[PDB]
Design a protein around this ligand. Structure first.
Ligand SMILES: O=c1[nH]cnc2ccccc12
Length: 165
């Protein structure tokens, strides 16, 4: 199971880790991807997870989009986890660098409540432009299921833990 996580609340745990390496090690039932509405896994967590699947995540995603159209900002879809997890829950947090409503971050985290346990990144953090401290607060106040957060950046991880209310 998950190891080396710091317990933040009854159900939220956090670790300074590369989510790709964490997924390859644990092989969780669900790994969360920081997706965009088109499931175009170019950079950030999405690009890293997709590269770990040898682009199989992108091929599967393009077929999903061709059939279903784009996701909504705040929405999600369950696809294969390939070599990383049983499933990948592609969740679209608002990208404030693309001018999207930051209030949609709570709706994005609500998708996590459909899964008993997840390995996840902080939604809308990193290249999505939101304040990661705000993302962690929305996560703890929205997610009721067991969420194991992987924060890649050590300096950000330390700031998140030291500022956690
Ligand atoms: O951008 C990232 N690349 C690789 N691993 C991560 C783990 C957690 C959060 C962000 C990342």
């Amino acid at each position: 199971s998950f190891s080396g996580y710091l317990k933040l609340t009854d159900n939220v745990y956090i670790k300074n880790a590369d989510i790709v390496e964490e997924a390859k090690k644990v092989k969780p039932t669900v790994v969360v991807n920081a997706a965009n509405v088109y499931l175009k896994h170019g950079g950030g967590v999405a690009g890293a997870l997709n590269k770990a699947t040898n682009n199989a995540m992108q091929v599967e995603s393009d077929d999903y989009i061709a059939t279903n159209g784009p996701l909504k900002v705040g929405g999600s879809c369950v696809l294969s986890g390939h070599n990383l997890a049983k499933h990948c829950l592609h969740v679209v947090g608002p990208n404030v660098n693309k001018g999207e409503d930051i209030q949609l971050l709570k709706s994005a985290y609500e998708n996590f409540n459909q899964h008993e346990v997840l390995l996840a990144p902080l939604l809308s953090a990193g290249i999505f432009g939101a304040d990661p401290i705000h993302s962690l607060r929305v996560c703890v106040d929205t997610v009721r299921t067991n969420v194991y957060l992987a924060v890649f950046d050590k300096n950000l991880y330390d700031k998140l833990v030291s500022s956690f209310l």
